[PDB]
Amino acid sequence: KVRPSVKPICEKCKVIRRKGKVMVICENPKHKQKQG
Amino acid sequence: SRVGKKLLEIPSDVTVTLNDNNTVAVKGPKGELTRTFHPDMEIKVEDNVLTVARPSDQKEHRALHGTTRSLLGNMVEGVSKGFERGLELVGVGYRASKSGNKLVLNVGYSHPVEIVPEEGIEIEVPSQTKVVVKGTDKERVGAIAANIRAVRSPEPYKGKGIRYEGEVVRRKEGK
Amino acid sequence: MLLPKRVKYRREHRGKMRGRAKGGTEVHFGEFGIQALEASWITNRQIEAARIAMTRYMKRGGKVWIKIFPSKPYTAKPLEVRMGSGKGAPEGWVAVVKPGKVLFEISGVSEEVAREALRLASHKLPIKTKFVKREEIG
Amino acid sequence: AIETKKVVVEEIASKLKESKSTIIVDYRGLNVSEVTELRKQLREANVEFKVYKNTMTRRAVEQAELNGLNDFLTGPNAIAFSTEDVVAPAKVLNDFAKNHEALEIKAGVIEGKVSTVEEVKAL
RNA sequence: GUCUUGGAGGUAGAGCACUGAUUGGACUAGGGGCCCCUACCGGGUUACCGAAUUCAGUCAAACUCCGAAUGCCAAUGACUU
RNA sequence: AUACGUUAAGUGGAAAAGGAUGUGGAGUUGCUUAGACAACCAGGAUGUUGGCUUAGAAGCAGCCACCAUUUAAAGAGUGCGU
RNA sequence: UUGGCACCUCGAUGUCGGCUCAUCGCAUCCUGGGGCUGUAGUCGGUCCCAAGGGUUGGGCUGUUCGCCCAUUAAAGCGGUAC
Numbered sequence: 001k002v003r004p005s006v007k008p009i010c011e012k013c014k015v016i017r018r019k020g021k022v023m024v025i026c027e028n029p030k031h032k033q034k035q036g
Numbered sequence: 037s038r039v040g041k042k043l044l045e046i047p048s049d050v051t052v053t054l055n056d057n058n059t060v061a062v063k064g065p066k067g068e069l070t071r072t073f074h075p076d077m078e079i080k081v082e083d084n085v086l087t088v089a090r091p092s093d094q095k096e097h098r099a100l101h102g103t104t105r106s107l108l109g110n111m112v113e114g115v116s117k118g119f120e121r122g123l124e125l126v127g128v129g130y131r132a133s134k135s136g137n138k139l140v141l142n143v144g145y146s147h148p149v150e151i152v153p154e155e156g157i158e159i160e161v162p163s164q165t166k167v168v169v170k171g172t173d174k175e176r177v178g179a180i181a182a183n184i185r186a187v188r189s190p191e192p193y194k195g196k197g198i199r200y201e202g203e204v205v206r207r208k209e210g211k
Numbered sequence: 212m213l214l215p216k217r218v219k220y221r222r223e224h225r226g227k228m229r230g231r232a233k234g235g236t237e238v239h240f241g242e243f244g245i246q247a248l249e250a251s252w253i254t255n256r257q258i259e260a261a262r263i264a265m266t267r268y269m270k271r272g273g274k275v276w277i278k279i280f281p282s283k284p285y286t287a288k289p290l291e292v293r294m295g296s297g298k299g300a301p302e303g304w305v306a307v308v309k310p311g312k313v314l315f316e317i318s319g320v321s322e323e324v325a326r327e328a329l330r331l332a333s334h335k336l337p338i339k340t341k342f343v344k345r346e347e348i349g
Numbered sequence: 350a351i352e353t354k355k356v357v358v359e360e361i362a363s364k365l366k367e368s369k370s371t372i373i374v375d376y377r378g379l380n381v382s383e384v385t386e387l388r389k390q391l392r393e394a395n396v397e398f399k400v401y402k403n404t405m406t407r408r409a410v411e412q413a414e415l416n417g418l419n420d421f422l423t424g425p426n427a428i429a430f431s432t433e434d435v436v437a438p439a440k441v442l443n444d445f446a447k448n449h450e451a452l453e454i455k456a457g458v459i460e461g462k463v464s465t466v467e468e469v470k471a472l
Numbered sequence: 473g474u475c476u477u478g479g480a481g482g483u484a485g486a487g488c489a490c491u492g493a494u495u496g497g498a499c500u501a502g503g504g505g506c507c508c509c510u511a512c513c514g515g516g517u518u519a520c521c522g523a524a525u526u527c528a529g530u531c532a533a534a535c536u537c538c539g540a541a542u543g544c545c546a547a548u549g550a551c552u553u
Numbered sequence: 554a555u556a557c558g559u560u561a562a563g564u565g566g567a568a569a570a571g572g573a574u575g576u577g578g579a580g581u582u583g584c585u586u587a588g589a590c591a592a593c594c595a596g597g598a599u600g601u602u603g604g605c606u607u608a609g610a611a612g613c614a615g616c617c618a619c620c621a622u623u624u625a626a627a628g629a630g631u632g633c634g635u
Numbered sequence: 636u637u638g639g640c641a642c643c644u645c646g647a648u649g650u651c652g653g654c655u656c657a658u659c660g661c662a663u664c665c666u667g668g669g670g671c672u673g674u675a676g677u678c679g680g681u682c683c684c685a686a687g688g689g690u691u692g693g694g695c696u697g698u699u700c701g702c703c704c705a706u707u708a709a710a711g712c713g714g715u716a717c
């Protein structure tokens with residue numbers, strides 16, 4: 001899932017940075033999203 | 037708190053030899069390990085005293101001052117007794133088997149698949165439906181186990197294929 | 212849809228929009244409000260859209276206060292036609308907003324819920340905003 | 350840390366009256382088991398079992414300014430308060446025997462508390 | 473040309489005193505609607521339209537109780553050209 | 554060249570609404586050796602699922618403001634749920 | 636693309652369709668590699684990387700358009716004085 005506006009959805013999502021990009025990982029794979 | 041300050045002890049068998057350029061190695065009851073570290077990062081060892089001296093506080097220094105300590109602990113632990121990790125093989129008729137030194141598996145594919153390890157990592161099939169890697173270096177046995185598991189990742193609708201030794205897998209349903 | 216009931220003139224200059232707001236820069240009909248930060252026009256329908264969204268989010272306990280009101284009309288010529296020979300026909304209604312104005316005011320609900328409602332309303336306006344609450348000292 | 354002093358001196362009045370008291374291991378305690386124990390109190394000794402469980406070992410080392418110099422081996426350790434305000438544990442000893450030999454919460458680290466300088470071998 | 477001094481004029485800005493536009497309260501006979509019962513009285517409401525009026529609050533190229541900086545017109549002195 | 558700061562993108566050497574534990578300053582402010590936040594050991598109910606409706610709804614068919622006591626807290630359910 | 640302006644060309648810058656020959660972009664039609672799925676499997680839906688190669692014969696109209704017949708893995712969209 002890719003979009004320019006990434007932000008948590010559930011209560012236990014998380015926000016990180018990999019290779020200068022913004023990412024969000026969570027248990028439910030449907031939440032996994034990456035900015036740009 | 038902070039991990040870069042916990043002091044490391046040294047069991048009697050562990051004979052670590054500090055060397056210049058942070059090229060320290062180690063000797064113990066299971067073999068040898070060695071790693072060179074960041075130059076400016078300071079390390080000095082006394083008997084059961086691992087002095088991870090950190091230079092001026094920065095970002096990279098605050099990172100290395102922890103990472104080096106963690107790796108040193110891992111290394112002494114490995115050379116003491118090493119690590120391992122089991123591998124579950126669920127299947128419905130899938131099963132593995134040893135051969136010579138290498139390892140072969142028969143998942144539902146139309147042909148056998150084989151994996152050979154390098155030195156220092158012994159594979160062992162205690163039961164023909166269970167595999168256990170074993171070796172001294174933690175990251176290396178991790179890599180080997182990952183290679184194995186990567187042959188047939190588990191399946192959601194029915195737990196099928198390789199699986200780490202105990203872990204929760206999602207579970208949907210078809211109809 | 213807000214619009215005057217009768218106007219003197221129907222076509223009218225557009226005019227410049229420099230300088231801060233004359234007055235009405237302090238919330239005094241409620242507890243919280245959004246304050247503009249850069250000049251623009253606000254279309255007749257943008258206002259009602261923001262208002263409906265904001266009032267739906269709330270549990271109707273509070274009340275709202277639309278401060279601004281569209282009065283100036285603006286024209287537009289028909290499509291695919293050369294230039295000149297008469298000003299166009301009146302089309303809609305806008306309301307100029309210079310920085311410092313206070314567009315909306317809420318009162319009757321908790322602080323954070325009003326903050327959320329105002330943030331949700333902000334995303335319908337063509338400008339950048341700021342959440343501001345009632346000056347207690349007056 | 351306002352009322353910490355307050356309660357740590359307040360426990361003096363409740364500790365000076367009795368002779369004997371008692372301690373209970375803290376963790377592995379079901380609050381269903383805790384409420385069963387509370388109702389067992391209510392039928393045996395209503396609330397006299399000190400179910401006050403919001404204290405840091407300073408509580409007992411500042412209650413030790415008079416006597417009871419033993420919590421140093423219980424404070425930094427599992428603690429579930431209690432006391433024996435009524436006469437010496439001729440009854441609550443066997444009460445605790447039947448309530449923690451195999452019941453709601455284990456006995457484990459329990460050594461009771463001070464009647465006199467002693468700690469164990471009560472009856 | 474500059475310094476000094478004196479004039480005419482309603483822009484920028486501001487303001488609601490006039491003319492239009494406009495928000496929220498107070499308050500309303502006149503009740504509109506509900507009705508009690510209104511066939512008709514009289515009465516709660518009037519959801520008043522509550523008209524004003526009043527209390528606060530926003531606007532204007534063809535609104536102004538106000539109103540600059542500049543520019544313009546002269547003077548008699550001075551210093552330069 | 555001198556002196557002191559900033560940026561790690563080749564920004565420098567092209568753009569917005571919006572998004573973000575990037576990073577430097579200036580603050581405001583709570584908790585805290587009576588021990589903080591983590592992490593690990595514990596637990597998280599009683600006329601009590603109470604007057605409940607749809608099979609228990611015993612956690613969330615969804616009506617009670619499904620309240621009050623045992624304390625040490627338990628919301629007679631945070632979420633996962635079933 | 637439909638438009639707006641009228642800056643170059645009126646002592647000449649010759650239109651639309653088709654034929655021969657092509658070449659470039661990628662916002663991808665096929666083939667290659669993946670994430671998620673309201674993905675059982677075989678089919679799919681959507682999004683990410685990818686421009687190497689490939690991308691049809693007829694009927695009706697001057698026709699680009701368009702409809703239809705029969706196939707193919709596929710019968711891509713655009714620029715180069717449409």
Ligand SMILES: [Mg+2]
Binds near residue numbers: 005
């Ligand atoms: Mg969105």
Ligand SMILES: [Mg+2]
Binds near residue numbers: 234235
């Ligand atoms: Mg005002």
Ligand SMILES: [Mg+2]
């Ligand atoms: Mg003006």
Ligand SMILES: [Mg+2]
């Ligand atoms: Mg004027």
Ligand SMILES: [Mg+2]
Binds near residue numbers: 566
């Ligand atoms: Mg650049």
Ligand SMILES: [Mg+2]
């Ligand atoms: Mg010629």
Ligand SMILES: [Mg+2]
């Ligand atoms: Mg692409």
Ligand SMILES: [Mg+2]
Binds near residue numbers: 717
């Ligand atoms: Mg052509």
Ligand SMILES: [Mg+2]
């Ligand atoms: Mg062109």
Ligand SMILES: [Zn+2]
Binds near residue numbers: 011012013031
């Ligand atoms: Zn999530």
